[PDB]
Protein backbone atom coordinates (compact mmCIF):
# COMPACT_ATOMS: atom_id res chain seq x y z
CA UNK A 1 0.00 0.00 0.00
CA UNK A 2 1.27 3.45 -0.99
CA UNK A 3 1.57 5.96 1.86
CA UNK A 4 0.46 9.44 0.70
CA UNK A 5 2.92 12.27 1.36
CA UNK A 6 0.17 14.24 3.17
CA UNK A 7 0.41 11.63 5.94
CA UNK A 8 4.23 11.54 6.21
CA UNK A 9 5.72 13.58 9.08
CA UNK A 10 8.74 14.47 6.90
CA UNK A 11 6.39 16.46 4.64
CA UNK A 12 3.84 17.77 7.18
CA UNK A 13 5.05 21.37 6.75
CA UNK A 14 4.63 21.35 2.94
CA UNK A 15 1.31 22.27 1.33
CA UNK A 16 0.90 20.44 -2.02
CA UNK A 17 0.04 22.41 -5.18
CA UNK A 18 -2.37 20.95 -7.77
CA UNK A 19 -1.65 20.94 -11.51
CA UNK A 20 -3.06 24.10 -13.09
CA UNK A 21 -4.64 22.55 -16.20
CA UNK A 22 -7.51 25.01 -16.47
CA UNK A 23 -11.03 23.78 -17.27
CA UNK A 24 -11.64 20.61 -19.31
CA UNK A 25 -8.15 20.21 -20.79
CA UNK A 26 -7.44 18.14 -23.90
CA UNK A 27 -4.99 15.18 -23.89
CA UNK A 28 -5.07 14.74 -20.10
CA UNK A 29 -3.06 11.85 -18.67
CA UNK A 30 -4.70 9.66 -16.02
CA UNK A 31 -1.75 10.10 -13.63
CA UNK A 32 -1.16 7.28 -11.15
CA UNK A 33 -1.73 8.04 -7.47
CA UNK A 34 2.05 7.92 -6.96
CA UNK A 35 2.98 10.27 -9.81
CA UNK A 36 0.27 12.87 -9.10
CA UNK A 37 1.21 12.94 -5.40
CA UNK A 38 4.92 13.33 -6.18
CA UNK A 39 4.25 16.10 -8.71
CA UNK A 40 1.90 17.87 -6.29
CA UNK A 41 4.77 18.08 -3.81
CA UNK A 42 7.36 18.92 -6.47
CA UNK A 43 5.18 21.87 -7.55
CA UNK A 44 5.28 23.11 -3.95
CA UNK A 45 9.02 22.42 -3.52
CA UNK A 46 9.95 24.14 -6.78
CA UNK A 47 7.66 27.13 -6.22
CA UNK A 48 9.31 27.88 -2.86
CA UNK A 49 12.70 26.95 -4.43
CA UNK A 50 13.66 24.65 -1.55
CA UNK A 51 17.18 23.18 -1.80
CA UNK A 52 17.22 20.12 0.44
CA UNK A 53 17.86 16.38 0.75
CA UNK A 54 14.12 15.62 0.68
CA UNK A 55 13.82 17.72 -2.49
CA UNK A 56 16.67 15.70 -4.03
CA UNK A 57 15.00 12.45 -2.92
CA UNK A 58 11.74 13.61 -4.56
CA UNK A 59 13.31 14.41 -7.95
CA UNK A 60 14.77 10.88 -8.13
CA UNK A 61 11.31 9.44 -7.36
CA UNK A 62 9.78 11.49 -10.21
CA UNK A 63 12.44 10.80 -12.89
CA UNK A 64 12.23 7.06 -12.14
CA UNK A 65 8.55 7.22 -13.10
CA UNK A 66 9.17 9.62 -16.00
CA UNK A 67 12.79 9.77 -17.28
CA UNK A 68 11.75 12.34 -19.91
CA UNK A 69 10.66 15.05 -17.42
CA UNK A 70 13.11 17.83 -18.38
CA UNK A 71 11.89 20.28 -15.70
CA UNK A 72 12.60 17.82 -12.88
CA UNK A 73 16.09 17.08 -14.25
CA UNK A 74 16.87 20.82 -14.36
CA UNK A 75 15.84 21.05 -10.71
CA UNK A 76 17.83 17.95 -9.77
CA UNK A 77 21.04 19.44 -11.17
CA UNK A 78 20.39 22.68 -9.24
CA UNK A 79 19.92 20.56 -6.11
CA UNK A 80 23.21 18.74 -6.76
CA UNK A 81 25.17 22.00 -7.12
CA UNK A 82 23.46 23.80 -4.17
CA UNK A 83 23.83 20.89 -1.74
CA UNK A 84 27.39 20.32 -2.98
CA UNK A 85 26.62 16.62 -3.57
CA UNK A 86 29.13 14.07 -4.85
CA UNK A 87 28.90 14.27 -8.64
CA UNK A 88 30.81 10.97 -8.84
CA UNK A 89 28.02 9.30 -6.85
CA UNK A 90 25.43 10.82 -9.20
CA UNK A 91 27.34 9.36 -12.17
CA UNK A 92 27.20 5.90 -10.58
CA UNK A 93 23.47 6.45 -10.07
CA UNK A 94 23.17 7.23 -13.80
CA UNK A 95 24.97 3.92 -14.44
CA UNK A 96 22.32 2.21 -12.26
CA UNK A 97 19.63 3.98 -14.33
CA UNK A 98 20.90 2.38 -17.57
CA UNK A 99 21.11 -1.07 -15.93
CA UNK A 100 17.51 -0.66 -14.70
CA UNK A 101 16.55 0.36 -18.27
CA UNK A 102 15.57 3.86 -17.17
CA UNK A 103 16.87 5.47 -20.32
CA UNK A 104 16.04 8.72 -22.10
CA UNK A 105 17.86 11.64 -23.67
CA UNK A 106 17.68 13.61 -20.41
CA UNK A 107 19.84 10.97 -18.71
CA UNK A 108 22.53 11.52 -21.38
CA UNK A 109 22.32 15.31 -21.10
CA UNK A 110 22.62 14.94 -17.32
CA UNK A 111 25.80 12.90 -17.88
CA UNK A 112 27.27 15.71 -20.02
CA UNK A 113 26.54 18.35 -17.36
CA UNK A 114 28.09 16.10 -14.69
CA UNK A 115 31.27 15.50 -16.68
CA UNK A 116 31.57 19.14 -17.64
CA UNK A 117 31.36 20.08 -13.93
CA UNK A 118 33.54 17.27 -12.51
CA UNK A 119 35.98 18.10 -15.31
CA UNK A 120 38.32 15.13 -14.62
CA UNK A 121 41.97 15.30 -15.72
CA UNK A 122 41.50 12.06 -17.68
CA UNK A 123 38.03 11.23 -19.08
CA UNK A 124 39.07 7.63 -19.98
CA UNK A 125 36.60 5.98 -17.56
CA UNK A 126 33.70 7.82 -19.22
CA UNK A 127 35.07 6.99 -22.69
CA UNK A 128 35.05 3.35 -21.55
CA UNK A 129 31.48 3.65 -20.27
CA UNK A 130 30.35 5.02 -23.65
CA UNK A 131 32.09 2.19 -25.55
CA UNK A 132 30.41 -0.43 -23.34
CA UNK A 133 27.11 1.39 -23.80
CA UNK A 134 27.56 1.34 -27.61
CA UNK A 135 28.34 -2.41 -27.93
CA UNK A 136 24.78 -3.82 -27.54
CA UNK A 137 23.22 -0.67 -29.10
CA UNK A 138 25.69 0.31 -31.87
CA UNK A 139 23.60 3.00 -33.61
CA UNK A 140 22.30 5.03 -30.65
CA UNK A 141 22.41 8.45 -32.26
CA UNK A 142 22.77 10.51 -29.09
CA UNK A 143 25.31 8.19 -27.51
CA UNK A 144 27.43 8.83 -30.62
CA UNK A 145 26.71 12.59 -30.27
CA UNK A 146 27.82 12.43 -26.63
CA UNK A 147 31.07 10.66 -27.62
CA UNK A 148 31.77 13.48 -30.11
CA UNK A 149 31.13 16.13 -27.42
CA UNK A 150 33.31 14.36 -24.86
CA UNK A 151 36.41 14.02 -27.03
CA UNK A 152 35.81 17.53 -28.39
CA UNK A 153 35.34 19.25 -25.04
CA UNK A 154 38.19 17.46 -23.28
CA UNK A 155 40.52 17.97 -26.24
CA UNK A 156 40.17 21.78 -25.98
CA UNK A 157 41.43 21.36 -22.42
CA UNK A 158 44.42 19.47 -23.89
CA UNK A 159 43.45 16.36 -21.92
CA UNK A 160 43.41 13.83 -24.79
CA UNK A 161 46.82 12.23 -25.40
CA UNK A 162 48.03 10.81 -28.73
CA UNK A 163 47.88 7.30 -27.22
CA UNK A 164 44.24 7.98 -26.32
CA UNK A 165 43.48 9.13 -29.89
CA UNK A 166 45.24 6.00 -31.20
CA UNK A 167 43.21 3.55 -29.12
CA UNK A 168 40.07 5.43 -30.16
CA UNK A 169 40.88 4.77 -33.83
CA UNK A 170 41.66 1.15 -32.85
CA UNK A 171 38.21 0.89 -31.24
CA UNK A 172 36.54 2.53 -34.24
CA UNK A 173 38.19 0.10 -36.68
CA UNK A 174 36.87 -2.82 -34.59
CA UNK A 175 33.32 -1.40 -34.71
CA UNK A 176 33.69 -1.15 -38.50
CA UNK A 177 35.12 -4.71 -38.60
CA UNK A 178 32.10 -6.00 -36.64
CA UNK A 179 29.62 -4.18 -38.91
CA UNK A 180 30.90 -2.45 -42.06
CA UNK A 181 27.36 -1.12 -42.51
CA UNK A 182 27.41 0.82 -39.21
CA UNK A 183 27.10 4.36 -40.56
CA UNK A 184 27.54 5.77 -37.03
CA UNK A 185 31.02 4.21 -36.89
CA UNK A 186 31.84 5.64 -40.33
CA UNK A 187 30.86 9.06 -38.93
CA UNK A 188 33.11 8.60 -35.90
CA UNK A 189 35.92 7.62 -38.26
CA UNK A 190 35.41 10.86 -40.20
CA UNK A 191 35.76 12.82 -36.94
CA UNK A 192 38.86 10.86 -35.93
CA UNK A 193 40.54 11.01 -39.36
CA UNK A 194 39.29 14.15 -41.14
CA UNK A 195 37.29 16.70 -39.12
CA UNK A 196 38.85 16.90 -35.63
CA UNK A 197 41.42 19.74 -35.19
CA UNK A 198 44.31 17.35 -34.45
CA UNK A 199 43.61 14.92 -37.31
CA UNK A 200 46.73 13.84 -39.21
CA UNK A 201 46.19 15.17 -42.74
CA UNK A 202 49.62 14.92 -44.40
CA UNK A 203 49.91 13.70 -48.03
CA UNK A 204 50.75 10.08 -47.08
CA UNK A 205 47.97 10.18 -44.47
CA UNK A 206 45.41 10.81 -47.23
CA UNK A 207 46.93 7.93 -49.25
CA UNK A 208 46.42 5.51 -46.33
CA UNK A 209 42.84 6.72 -45.93
CA UNK A 210 42.03 6.05 -49.59
CA UNK A 211 43.44 2.52 -49.14
CA UNK A 212 41.16 1.92 -46.14
CA UNK A 213 38.08 3.30 -47.96
CA UNK A 214 38.69 1.28 -51.17
CA UNK A 215 39.37 -1.92 -49.15
CA UNK A 216 35.98 -1.37 -47.48
CA UNK A 217 34.29 -0.91 -50.87
CA UNK A 218 35.90 -4.10 -52.22
CA UNK A 219 34.75 -5.97 -49.11
CA UNK A 220 31.16 -4.68 -49.35
CA UNK A 221 30.54 -3.14 -52.85
CA UNK A 222 26.88 -2.28 -52.13
CA UNK A 223 27.74 -0.46 -48.87
CA UNK A 224 26.22 3.03 -49.26
CA UNK A 225 28.17 4.16 -46.16
CA UNK A 226 31.46 3.33 -47.88
CA UNK A 227 30.54 5.16 -51.11
CA UNK A 228 29.34 8.25 -49.21
CA UNK A 229 32.59 8.35 -47.22
CA UNK A 230 34.63 8.06 -50.44
CA UNK A 231 32.69 10.85 -52.14
CA UNK A 232 32.84 13.04 -49.02
CA UNK A 233 36.58 12.43 -48.65
CA UNK A 234 37.50 13.29 -52.25
CA UNK A 235 35.28 16.38 -52.17
CA UNK A 236 36.64 17.70 -48.84
CA UNK A 237 40.29 17.43 -49.93
CA UNK A 238 39.51 18.49 -53.53
CA UNK A 239 40.97 15.26 -54.96
CA UNK A 240 40.39 14.23 -58.62
CA UNK A 241 38.19 11.16 -59.22
CA UNK A 242 39.91 10.01 -62.44
CA UNK A 243 43.07 8.63 -60.73
CA UNK A 244 40.89 6.38 -58.53
CA UNK A 245 38.57 5.41 -61.45
CA UNK A 246 40.24 2.03 -62.25
CA UNK A 247 39.28 0.74 -58.77
CA UNK A 248 35.61 1.64 -59.32
CA UNK A 249 35.08 0.81 -63.03
CA UNK A 250 34.47 -2.96 -62.55
CA UNK A 251 31.36 -2.05 -60.53
CA UNK A 252 29.89 -0.15 -63.52
CA UNK A 253 29.86 -2.90 -66.20
CA UNK A 254 45.41 1.42 -55.18
CA UNK A 255 43.46 -1.65 -53.96
CA UNK A 256 41.51 -3.36 -56.77
CA UNK A 257 38.30 -5.44 -56.64
CA UNK A 258 38.73 -9.15 -55.86
CA UNK A 259 38.73 -11.36 -58.97
CA UNK A 260 36.29 -12.94 -59.10
CA UNK A 261 33.92 -10.48 -57.40
CA UNK A 262 32.32 -11.58 -54.10
CA UNK A 263 29.21 -13.77 -54.45
CA UNK A 264 25.89 -11.86 -54.53
CA UNK A 265 27.20 -8.65 -56.11
CA UNK A 266 24.85 -7.79 -59.00
CA UNK A 267 26.14 -5.14 -61.41
CA UNK A 268 26.08 -2.24 -61.81
CA UNK A 269 26.26 -0.65 -58.37
CA UNK A 270 24.22 2.60 -58.62
CA UNK A 271 26.72 4.74 -56.69
CA UNK A 272 29.56 3.32 -58.78
CA UNK A 273 27.71 4.69 -61.82
CA UNK A 274 27.37 8.07 -60.06
CA UNK A 275 31.16 8.01 -59.62
CA UNK A 276 31.68 7.30 -63.33
CA UNK A 277 29.22 10.06 -64.26
CA UNK A 278 30.96 12.62 -62.03
CA UNK A 279 34.39 11.58 -63.32
CA UNK A 280 33.13 12.32 -66.85
CA UNK A 281 32.04 15.80 -65.67
CA UNK A 282 35.55 16.24 -64.23
CA UNK A 283 36.93 15.51 -67.72
CA UNK A 284 34.36 17.92 -69.27
CA UNK A 285 32.80 14.95 -71.10
CA UNK A 286 29.23 16.16 -70.52
CA UNK A 287 27.65 13.91 -73.18
CA UNK A 288 29.14 10.70 -71.76
CA UNK A 289 28.06 11.89 -68.30
CA UNK A 290 24.48 12.55 -69.46
CA UNK A 291 24.41 9.01 -70.90
CA UNK A 292 25.14 7.26 -67.58
CA UNK A 293 22.73 9.58 -65.73
CA UNK A 294 20.05 8.58 -68.26
CA UNK A 295 20.93 4.91 -67.66
CA UNK A 296 20.54 5.39 -63.89
CA UNK A 297 17.17 7.06 -64.47
CA UNK A 298 15.61 4.55 -66.88
CA UNK A 299 17.40 1.29 -66.00
CA UNK A 300 19.76 0.96 -63.04
CA UNK A 301 18.21 3.09 -60.24
CA UNK A 302 14.62 3.78 -61.32
CA UNK A 303 13.38 4.74 -57.85
CA UNK A 304 15.35 7.97 -58.40
CA UNK A 305 14.27 8.34 -62.06
CA UNK A 306 13.40 12.03 -61.58
CA UNK A 307 16.63 12.95 -59.79
CA UNK A 308 18.99 11.26 -62.27
CA UNK A 309 17.00 12.91 -65.10
CA UNK A 310 17.57 16.26 -63.38
CA UNK A 311 21.33 15.53 -63.23
CA UNK A 312 21.24 14.48 -66.90
CA UNK A 313 19.46 17.73 -67.89
CA UNK A 314 22.14 19.67 -65.99
CA UNK A 315 24.69 18.58 -68.63
CA UNK A 316 22.61 18.70 -71.83
Amino acid sequence: TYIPMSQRRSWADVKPIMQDDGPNPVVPIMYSEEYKDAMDYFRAIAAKEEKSERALELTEIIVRMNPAHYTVWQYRFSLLTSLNKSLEDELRLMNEFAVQNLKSYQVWHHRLLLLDRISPQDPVSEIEYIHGSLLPDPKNYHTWAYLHWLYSHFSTLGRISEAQWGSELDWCNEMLRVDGRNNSAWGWRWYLRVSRPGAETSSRSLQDELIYILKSIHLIPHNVSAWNYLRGFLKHFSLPLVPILPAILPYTAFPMPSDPLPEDTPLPVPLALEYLADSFIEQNRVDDAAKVFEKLSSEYDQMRAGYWEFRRRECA
Partner: peptide, 26 residues
Protein backbone atom coordinates in the same frame (compact mmCIF):
# COMPACT_ATOMS: atom_id res chain seq x y z
CA UNK B 1 4.29 9.96 -63.61
CA UNK B 2 7.02 9.31 -66.21
CA UNK B 3 9.84 9.85 -63.70
CA UNK B 4 7.89 8.53 -60.69
CA UNK B 5 7.42 4.78 -61.25
CA UNK B 6 5.09 2.75 -59.02
CA UNK B 7 6.64 0.19 -56.66
CA UNK B 8 4.40 -2.39 -58.39
CA UNK B 9 5.97 -1.66 -61.81
CA UNK B 10 9.53 -2.17 -60.53
CA UNK B 11 11.52 -5.30 -59.62
CA UNK B 12 11.69 -5.93 -55.86
CA UNK B 13 15.02 -7.47 -54.85
CA UNK B 14 16.79 -7.57 -51.44
CA UNK B 15 19.78 -5.34 -50.78
CA UNK B 16 22.76 -7.47 -51.98
CA UNK B 17 24.79 -9.15 -49.22
CA UNK B 18 28.15 -9.23 -51.06
CA UNK B 19 28.73 -12.39 -48.97
CA UNK B 20 29.41 -10.31 -45.84
CA UNK B 21 26.56 -10.75 -43.32
CA UNK B 22 26.18 -8.16 -40.51
CA UNK B 23 23.69 -6.98 -37.87
CA UNK B 24 22.52 -4.21 -40.24
CA UNK B 25 21.78 -6.62 -43.11
CA UNK B 26 19.99 -9.04 -40.78
Amino acid sequence: TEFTPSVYSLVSKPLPSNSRPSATLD
